[PDB]
Design a protein around this ligand. Sequence first.
Ligand code: ADP
Ligand code: ADP
Ligand code: ADP
Ligand code: MG
Ligand code: MG
Ligand code: MG
Ligand code: ZN
Lengths: 621, 621, 565
Amino acid sequence: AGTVVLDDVELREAQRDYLDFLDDEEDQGIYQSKVRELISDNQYRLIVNVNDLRRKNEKRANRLLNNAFEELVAFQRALKDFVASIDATYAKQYEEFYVGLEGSFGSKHVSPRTLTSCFLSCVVCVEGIVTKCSLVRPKVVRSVHYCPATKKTIERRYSDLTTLVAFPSSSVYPTKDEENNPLETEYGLSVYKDHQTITIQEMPEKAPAGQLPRSVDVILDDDLVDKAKPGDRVQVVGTYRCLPGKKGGYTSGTFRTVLIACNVKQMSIAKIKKFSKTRSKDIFDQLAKSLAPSIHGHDYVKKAILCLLLGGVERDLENGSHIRGDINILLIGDPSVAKSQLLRYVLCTAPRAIPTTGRGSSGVGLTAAVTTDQETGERRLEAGAMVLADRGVVCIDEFDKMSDMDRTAIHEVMEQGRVTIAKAGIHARLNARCSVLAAANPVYGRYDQYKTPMENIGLQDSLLSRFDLLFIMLDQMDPEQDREISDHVLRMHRYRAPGEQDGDAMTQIYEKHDNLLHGTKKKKEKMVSAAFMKKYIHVAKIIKPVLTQESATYIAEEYSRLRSQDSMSSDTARTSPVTARTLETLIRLATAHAKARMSKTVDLQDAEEAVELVQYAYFKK
Amino acid sequence: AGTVVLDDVELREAQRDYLDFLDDEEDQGIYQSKVRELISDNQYRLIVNVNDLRRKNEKRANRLLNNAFEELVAFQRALKDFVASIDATYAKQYEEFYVGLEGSFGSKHVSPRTLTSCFLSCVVCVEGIVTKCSLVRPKVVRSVHYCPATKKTIERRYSDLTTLVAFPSSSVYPTKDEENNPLETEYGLSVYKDHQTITIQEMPEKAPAGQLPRSVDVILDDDLVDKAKPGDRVQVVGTYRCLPGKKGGYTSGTFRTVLIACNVKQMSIAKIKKFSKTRSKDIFDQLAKSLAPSIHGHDYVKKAILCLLLGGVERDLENGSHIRGDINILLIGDPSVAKSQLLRYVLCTAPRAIPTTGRGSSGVGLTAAVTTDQETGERRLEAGAMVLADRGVVCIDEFDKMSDMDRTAIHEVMEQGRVTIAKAGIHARLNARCSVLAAANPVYGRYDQYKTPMENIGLQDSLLSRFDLLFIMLDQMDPEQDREISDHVLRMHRYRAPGEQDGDAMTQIYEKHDNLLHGTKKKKEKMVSAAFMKKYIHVAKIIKPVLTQESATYIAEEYSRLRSQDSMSSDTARTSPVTARTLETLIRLATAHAKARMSKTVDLQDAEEAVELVQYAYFKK
Amino acid sequence: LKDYALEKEKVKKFLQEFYQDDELGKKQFKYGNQLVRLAHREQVALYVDLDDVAEDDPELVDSICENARRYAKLFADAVQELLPQYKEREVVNKDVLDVYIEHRLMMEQRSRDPGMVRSPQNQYPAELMRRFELYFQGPSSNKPRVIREVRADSVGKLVTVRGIVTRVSEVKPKMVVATYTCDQCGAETYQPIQSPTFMPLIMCPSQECQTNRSGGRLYLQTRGSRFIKFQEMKMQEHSDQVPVGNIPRSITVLVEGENTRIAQPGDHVSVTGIFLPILRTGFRQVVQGLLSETYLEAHRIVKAASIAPEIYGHEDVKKALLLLLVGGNICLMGDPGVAKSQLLSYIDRLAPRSQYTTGRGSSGVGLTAAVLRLTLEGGALVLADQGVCCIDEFDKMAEADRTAIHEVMEQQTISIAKAGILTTLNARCSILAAANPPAALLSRFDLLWLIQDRPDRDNDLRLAQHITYVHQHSRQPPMKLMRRYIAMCREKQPMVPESLADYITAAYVEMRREAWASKDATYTSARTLLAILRLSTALARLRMVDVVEKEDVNEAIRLMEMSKD
DNA sequence: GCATGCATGCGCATGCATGCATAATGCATGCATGCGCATGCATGC
DNA sequence: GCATGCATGCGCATGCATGCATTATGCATGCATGCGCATGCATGC
Ligand SMILES: Nc1ncnc2c1ncn2[C@@H]1O[C@H](COP(=O)(O)OP(=O)(O)O)[C@@H](O)[C@H]1O
Ligand SMILES: Nc1ncnc2c1ncn2[C@@H]1O[C@H](COP(=O)(O)OP(=O)(O)O)[C@@H](O)[C@H]1O
Ligand SMILES: Nc1ncnc2c1ncn2[C@@H]1O[C@H](COP(=O)(O)OP(=O)(O)O)[C@@H](O)[C@H]1O
Ligand SMILES: [Mg+2]
Ligand SMILES: [Mg+2]
Ligand SMILES: [Mg+2]
Ligand SMILES: [Zn+2]
């Protein structure tokens, strides 16, 4: 086609507007460093805040939201121009670059249930869960052929979705020469791009109760191929378009609507160094004390939860042997001792946390399963709760109600951290390294003091050895303790959020002091802010300490001392048996304490703290 | 169409070969100056000798003659490259340049009768006469449109004969926008090229006697539009191709063959300055003496013919008055005095010479005619012999046999030099400035001496006054004159061309002396070569002399003397009457003599020579 | 490329600006007055000079030159927008077309509210309501071109040409916009025309017919339609510009409303025009692609004393020629060598309407008239109506031509009755004839001049001196004024008083008596008296006198005596 | 000069190669889901 | 621990929207040339 366009006021003006938008010379803009980062990382697309564009140029934002394709084309042209300007050499590699979108879209923030034809041809944002995914497939863009008879090579260009409507003249694969000499395809010189299709469903938590769900279909291009997986909660921003049906005579008048993604999102130094170096022991002291103001007392359980948050060190050797580094805890107590509050707080704070109660999930939904795909006849693996929580936390409330077979299944995860799966036609070893919290009621409803803990717990020695720590909590009815508990509870109850009028319906390292949440006496001390706590926890989890020679003999001698004291402990009973796992638990707790205070080696104080914890947990009066 | 070609050995090698062909750096080539001349003259095509190409590269010449289109494309690409190289600015004006061909094609030199399918797709050369021509018509190449509704302008490109076969998708004129908004054509911004069609017939002189003629059809492109006219003898070099018929289901299998022209040809200082400045009078002396060695004696007739060759000066004034500058001669003599030999020699030597005998051409075929074109119903003008011979020579043998009406028609050409033509619907004044030679036999077969020349000539005084000069030639049977004539005739008869073996079947200013053609006695003098004679005649015809005050009174007094001597001439009769035309004849002959010797002004000697000629011609014993 | 809005504003300000030029020696608002006259029906076309625009902006002039049609349309729209501002009163007297325009505007105001949405098809065509035409005058700096050299490079440009007219078409109306009325509604439909042929519509696009889906059918109307005056012209090159050995080329011109009826066949014209093509659909051709035919759209068409001072002598003949030019048939017979043809050439060049014939080249159909595809086209005698005709070599003409010439001289009309032609043609022209040495010439013609070449030495020597002077200095020894003088002279008409009759009568009688005394005399009749009266009236007209005087009669008598002797 | 011959010239019919105009219906395939069957897991007593 | 219940799971039929496959003949137009006619030119005697 020889038709060309000479002038177009709108397109030229829009391109000029984007050129001025992405200059960042007389402004505090950052996009220049973003482009330099893209050049450094060999990536070929940019993400631009919609709110930023609206602030700088409201008319362009309005036009882009109301009309997508032409404005996106102008964006891509402007990106090509500026990439050529900054570094023309890098722009040679890729044909055209792409634009992502970000920011608060406002009215266009639309649920899969509320997508309508009113938003067609516009850019929309949607939040959902992923249910179906397809295999990655290549697609031809540029084809190259060679003719052995005449020693000539030719090239053909393809453009199918670049243009809105395609015709039979295009998309034809050449096979013969002008004189019927055969052509040989040369796959090395051709160009291909990847293609994938996914399906998104409205989350069951958001859908109205008792109603069937509604879903949308998404196409993922070459860059965003591997960014999504089934069973995942995502947010997708992209165009909403109609699908051209293939040629025919009579049409019913109903198109197919498909969302074409442009952005896919998985929804989620000096201060730290100074604080750590100055505090050392006070680091873990305050972190244990400031774990959760909403919960009263129970310092040992807070210490244990902090040890889970920091964790041990995974180790590997020459022979391929694996040594576990995770910690596991079981709490048993009387009703209303706030075990479930602790579980919920750990769910909120931990990065990868999944709650799975006793009978809520069975043995199949915990680890994994194998299903025969009807579409192809092959065998596929579906991951369970524990496989999804790799290097994460699984919380199990009402642990006693869980059946025996489920606990035998959990043995594989608790011992080695791997899951072996096999059915005729497929077999695999999946990684499931994880940590477990569990809370179980006593068998008699309330913990009996006179009976030994073995009768009350009612669990076999193997399962007890599987757990690193056992804790027993009691509701002692001391008048002064009850007074303290009532004071704390009513102080929390009377508190109201600042900035909210009374009677209405419904970052510094240390938190600001509060008259009610802290109290007048506590003015001499402060609590650590949640955000800094999370940052410090992440940094500590990164750090890799090493064990010293001073503490190894000390810990070994104390383990031997405990195994000999087994005969000496005559006035009290033992909660858990002492096996070879106890020594690994000692080393693990020592390393966790060494993680608490940023350093390079494990010292004696960490071993002493670990041993104090072990002595407290393993024996009771 | 997205199909492209990456490699082609033959085309790239041919382009490289032409690049090396047109370099002219380490060679004595001239094409660089040719390109510079083309840039100077704003022309956009080149002519290249085929024999030169064959000498430099025989394989390329063979391929070009055997295969035309691809090789011509390579030539045009190479021209574009070198025009860009020498001056890239000039190459911007024109899309693509073109190549002409020249030289001896040899076997491919083909008559319109001998063109066959064996020469299809090759470059051929043909010699013929032009019979039909068509009006010049523009053709669209690039179209430009504007939309007042959306203020957008678009452009469409057309390429019909650039590609061998065209399809209905192309050659479509756009009239509506994508949203049916009307478009307004803007003829200023579009691009057009001229187009013409002509027909060529084999010349009747070359065709076998008694057989019907055969013709070829030629298409003339934008450059060669005005290079041909009907009734013209031309040589055309170009491709010979088939013509694609328009779409249909059933075909008889017979194509139309059309020749596409690439070249159209109309078939045809120090020495001069030194010779003229040194010789002066001897210039015309030798030119008269060396006019034609094949003819014996008759110095006066040779002088008169030389005066025709040089001619007078055309003059114009303020009031639009025109003054004739041509000369006219009539010879009357006994049989075998070589009048027709003189006419044939003047035909051979003069640039534009046309022979038209007495009854060979009538009054209509002499001047012009008007014909009603059946194709359109309009009136068209067809030029006769005298209109074609503008600023030329018409030779009329057997002038006495011409009818009276034809001579009355010739009056208009002889007096003013123009032809007035009129028929209801059209009227014109055509230019016919010309000079006439005429030879007429005496009425009595042989010239009678005793009777006055008026009885012998038998022509009215008006026609005699129309002619500038009258000459009478006689065959006097003097024994010594007969001996001289026999010597000359037999010397010419015994002569043989040098380089030709005896008995076989069938540039220096001065000609080399010959033993027989000149003789032993004539060694003291030499004759002027024909080529230098033609060059000098052309240069003299260019020169524009001016009349001096010295000779005007002298000539006027001699004219009065002649008109008074009219009573004094009692012993002899007068051949021609003395009218006002005699004075103009005197001035004309004076200016012709002044042309003979290159100078700036007319002198007295030229007037004396003119008067001697007049005295000799106007009276006889 | 530049936006059309800015240049439209520039055009408007240019029309509103100029105050400079005035003929009476002042500063006058010319374009304002032109626009005020244009407001009513006191001027129906406007001509714009491209020399005046050149003062402030030459790029506008260049863009107008290369893209003339678009700028013509822009100028028309700008002037139409300006017209309401300059309007000061309603039309004093108006015709049918104005009645439609006023009625349509009135009902447009009646119906259309300012806020309602109007479809782009719902508006009136611009040219239907418009009644003024705009034309351009060629730049003075621009050089006129030649018919032979205008080619594809000149398509769409603005050009100026000079040529000779050979064919003119009779005036016929040309359609501009066609008006349709529906069969079942009061709405009106308009169809613009920009093609040589068009296809009339059938169904009604009106909104009411669409809503009801009635299927009403359209009918043409002629009263509501707009028509323009259209003419077709054929031009040829001057004989001066033709190359060696070729034939003059021709071009075709189209002529619009006010430019119609300006040019006549045989005139030399200068035309300012636009060079545009016509897309041709018809018989199949050899070469594929889009071919076209070129034509020219015009916007403006622009068309005693010494007589032949180069020729020595013949003073009395020159006086007779002057009288023949001024007016109230002359024949010259001469020996060869005396310049009789050059006098006829000078007469042809001097006269406003003139023709010159040389002999058998223009014989037959070149005279009288003939029918061509049907229209009747005249010859030289027809073209020279109310002018002067010149004929050379009269005796060599065929008998039919001589009979026609005699009829023209005596009766002043031509009658043709042949197969396909039955007409009488008006030829009010006076004839000058040249010939070589009969009773017909004496009886029919008014004045005969016999030029005999007597070889007197003094006269011949003076003629030789004059010819040498002419050939050497290219000027005689020491026309517009002559044309203006003749035009002013012919305006008046003297009259013969009653008394002088007696004197004239006496003279006539005596003259005839002398002619009866000289038996060698040949002709005297009342025609001689009529010729004398006509010559005296012509001389009195030359003196601009209301009453014929004695000197004119004496000079006429002397001239006739000199001619007869 | 008048009487005659006649090569040129023009308009409307048919014959023949190319070229132009027309234009819905019936049959096949993959996605969704019912119905019978055997294995296997989980839950009581 | 053995007897029973049962939520999961698999393979082949039909129903229904989209999608796929098929496919020469008759009529119109411009170029070439015959046949009757009137004008006009040229050639004798
Ligand atoms: N130490 C404590 N500090 C603050 N509140 C407590 C404490 N112990 C119990 N509570 C209150 O008692 C309730 C116990 O509920 P829950 O955590 O469900 O108990 P359990 O998990 O033992 O069944 C909570 O709402 C909590 O507010
Ligand atoms: N002066 C001359 N010089 C040479 N040859 C002559 C001369 N006069 C006559 N001839 C010969 O006589 C022949 C005359 O033939 P031609 O020229 O036809 O005579 P004309 O033209 O008089 O009928 C020529 O072939 C020529 O060779
Ligand atoms: N009186 C004169 N004055 C000037 N030139 C003259 C005069 N008489 C004749 N001539 C010249 O003589 C020539 C006569 O030729 P032309 O007029 O054609 O003769 P005719 O008209 O008799 O055929 C002209 O070119 C003219 O220049
Ligand atoms: Mg609980
Ligand atoms: Mg001869
Ligand atoms: Mg004359
Ligand atoms: Zn209607």
